[PDB]
Symmetry: D2
Subunit: 121 residues, 4 copies
């Protein structure tokens, strides 16, 4: 009932497209953000993830990594695909954004955390 395939937009205005999910639950996609004002446009970064196929849940958990094309950073997202109080699909996710640091002594401050909610575009 809740399928990851398709076009999504989030609460900060980023968009993401996800292709077909195979029988192993693997999928690829693209992740688009602004930077920043009306002016001007965008960066596209690839994403790769898997949805959990245990018990063929109608609302499966999933995870994906975005391999940023314009920085040395990586973000991972994890969450669950829900049906809301009737019909519309919603991805409730949390993410970790990992910055590159040059010294292992700075490792402690390299990880940001937050949320995103996605709806169909």
């Amino acid at each position: 009932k809740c399928s990851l395939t398709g076009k999504w937009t989030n609460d900060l205005g980023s968009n993401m497209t996800i292709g077909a999910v195979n029988s192993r639950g693997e999928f690829t996609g693209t992740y688009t953000t602004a930077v920043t004002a009306t002016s001007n446009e965008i960066k596209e970064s690839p994403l790769h993830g898997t949805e959990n196929t245990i018990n063929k849940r109608t609302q499966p958990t999933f995870g994906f990594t975005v391999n940023w094309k314009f920085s040395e950073s990586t973000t991972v997202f994890t969450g669950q695909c829900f049906i809301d109080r009737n019909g519309k699909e919603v991805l409730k996710t949390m993410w970790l954004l990992r910055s590159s640091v040059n010294d292992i002594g700075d490792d402690w401050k390299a990880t940001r955390v937050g949320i995103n909610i996605f709806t169909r575009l």
Copy 2:
């Protein structure tokens, strides 16, 4: 200099094997835990991820998703491959563990966070 390919063990005793990383930074492997019980014995779950290839860093960031085979949960891990002060390779990671919930009203309690440090096996 720090390469994800190979066998790793962490601070809680789980092991992980990662395969070759392709020119897009993509890799697959397997994640093994313990400590359930048995006279052994373990579970093996596949993982899929990407290493960031921007500026061909010697200590790249990376993320991967573990698609648990024995539960409806997903974990994502993000971190950086370092050469430590002592010259040995280490993966400093943080993870989010997403539990499946039945109602979107329980979404708030579905995410655990923690760390893992990996060294070569």
Copy 3:
């Protein structure tokens, strides 16, 4: 311009009252939830925290700890008091929920993470 003192409600329906903030940035208050059951009905737990007073910012950061009265758990919340784009006060927060575990070997799964957004009641 954004002051923590007063009554707040969040996105999950919990309410919070915060008292006066003293010259050191210290405050006390109460945190109320739902949605257990009853014909009511609620639990009230005390909270204690500090607002950062450096540079007398109009949108200060702050943290507080809620000492749950009905469990062995603790939550900490950190965030910033903003004047939103629409001119209304909002607390954008993130929290960690620490569960009590009996063995130090289960420490790895004792921490949940999430967000809460508060507006004036």
Copy 4:
């Protein structure tokens, strides 16, 4: 058996002192870090927290906020006081570091996450 009162040091070399905990579980302390090389010394910031007193656990959960004196940031810590495989006390904590941002549009990148382990000084 595990009491928060006393002098502690962590895995990054920060120290913290915590005073007496009252009957409500409230405590104050001081949090000291370096910045950075042998040269030279330190900053001291106050801390305020509470330990959970439910079921008078020998290994209670606790939380505290550090109100940084040299920045507009706030950190909160939550964790549990353990006795380890015999006699020595250990605080296993996780933290959220909240940076001040000027626009609510940057709120999403304002929170870092990590761990600290403390032992008696």
